[PDB]
Amino acid sequence: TSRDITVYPKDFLTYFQRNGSAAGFDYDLATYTQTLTPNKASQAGNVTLKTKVDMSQNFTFTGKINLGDKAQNAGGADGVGFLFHPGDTNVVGAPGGAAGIGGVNGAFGFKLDTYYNGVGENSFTPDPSNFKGKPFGAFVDGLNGQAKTIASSAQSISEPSNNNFVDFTMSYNGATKVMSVTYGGQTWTQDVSSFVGTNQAMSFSIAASTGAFMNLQQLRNVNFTYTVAQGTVIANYVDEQGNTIAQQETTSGDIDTPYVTSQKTIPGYTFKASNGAATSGNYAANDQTVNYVYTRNQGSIDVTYIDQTTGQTLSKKDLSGGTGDSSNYTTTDTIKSYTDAGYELVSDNYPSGGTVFTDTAQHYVVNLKQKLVVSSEQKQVNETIQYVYEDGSKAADDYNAPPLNFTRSVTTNQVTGEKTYGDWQAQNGDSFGEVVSPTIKGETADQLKIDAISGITANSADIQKKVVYKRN
Ligand SMILES: [Ca+2]
């Protein structure tokens, strides 16, 4: 592998970060010594590995640990915890009974517990009963957050004494997933395959803890041959309201080596912004998430109603919605109002079976004309000559003349009420004939004839004449 190095004593601080207690002390570059905790109460100091570890390759950890100058009976505590978890390179475990492993998720490793915790918290299960007041080295199951000691791995160790450094070797087989830890003559072996659940890259922490009891806890001549894990960029494609719209695109690569992400073209959506990490960058030991936000594409549909008689817009409806959704708009309601008001529908290009908003705009038109109802009014001009005696009694039947009929069209607008009259056409003529008055036997008439009356119009008034007959 290319991502595969050996961390030398002289470069300890390059690859390890002094946290809590340890950050008060400078790595002595003559002894190659790093203080985790001093001989003081309520301490908590760790070294977190800056990178991560490929938990599928072969790593060999070498060094000497000073567990202090006091046993538990003599007021000595708490021990040295080795942490392996899949989480952040900066997350470290709870102190005391959790021994630098408990209270992280997906956590496992090896402790030298120089203090027997018999009373269990929510962060650690009681230490094994077969070790009451006795120092021991053990593997721990920290997956469910609660550090549980593997009672199989529980072998006794030499009490902390005179601040003496004992040899420590932790070796791991990638394919077997088997860890071999040797602390000064005692030897441990455990199958961590159960503990590297799926994630071939784990965070590393060496931690130390004091409480009421205390011990100077240090590390010396550290040698860590391992395969540096690869960084992992994650890329999400989501709408504005969180909901994912495209498959998340998890890449992976050597750290400080370019990663590149891609804006996805997404049917029904336009890119808005990239929240989280840069779309272009370099790879990093913790997991960088580039989200891609998209807007739900909205389509436009308008329906214009036009009075063709005025050539002017009656009303316009504007529908906007998501590319694919139904407007649930009908023209019949807005047509009804108009056809009620005395409009006649000319044309409707709006689809009968509803519309669907699309990426491209939709425009529909409804032409209505002011309804025109052609009527026909008829007028008639009449000539009636009555033939009477001086008493007002009838000498003869009234002559009712061939009537002069007139007719004009009357176009009526049902929207305005306006009446468009045509020209008063004459059906029968303009001239009333001459009417010679009857000759009654033994009478003489005041008018012997009624003269022809011409130039009668539809405006002309009915003629009402009267012939009076005198005796002899
Ligand atoms: Ca303990």
Author numbering: 40 to 511
Sentences from the study reporting this entry:
Here, we experimentally clarified the structure and function of the lactococcal cell surface protein YwfG. Amino acid sequence analysis using the Phyre2 and Pfam servers indicated that the 120-kDa protein contained a leguminous-type (L-type) lectin domain (Lec), a mucin-binding protein domain (Mbp), and four mucus-binding protein repeats (MubRs), followed by a C-terminal LPXTG motif. Structural analysis revealed that YwfG28–511 is composed of three different domains: Lec, Mbp, and MubR. Lactococcus lactis G50 YwfG has a Lec domain at the tip of an approximately 600–650-Å long column consisting of one Mbp and four MubRs extending from the cell wall, suggesting that the structure is suitable for binding to distant target glycans.
Next, we elucidated the crystal structure of recombinant YwfG28–511. We solved it by the molecular replacement method at 2.50-Å resolution. The crystal belonged to space group I222 with two molecules (I and II) per asymmetric unit. Molecule I was modeled with continuous residues from 40–511, whereas only residues 41–417 and 446–465 were modeled in molecule II. Compared with molecule I, molecule II had a more bent structure with a larger angle between domains. YwfG28–511 fragment had an overall elongated shape with an overall diameter of 40 Å and length of 180 Å, comprised 35 β-sheets and 4 α-helices, and was formed by head-to-tail tandem connection of the three domains, Lec, Mbp, and MubR1. Starting from the N-terminus, the first domain (residues 41–268) had a jelly roll–type β-sandwich structure comprising 15 β-strands and 3 short α-helices. A calcium-binding site was observed between sheet-II and the loop connecting the β7 and β8 strands (loop 7–8). One Ca2+ ion was coordinated by Asp152 (Oδ1 and Oδ2) belonging to β7; Tyr154 (O), Asn156 (Oδ1), and Asp166 (Oδ1) located in loop 7–8; and one water molecule. The N-terminal subdomain (Sub-N, residues 337–409) had a structure called a ubiquitin-like β-grasp fold, similar to that found in proteins in the immunoglobulin-binding superfamily, formed from six β-strands (β22–β27) and one α-helix (α4).
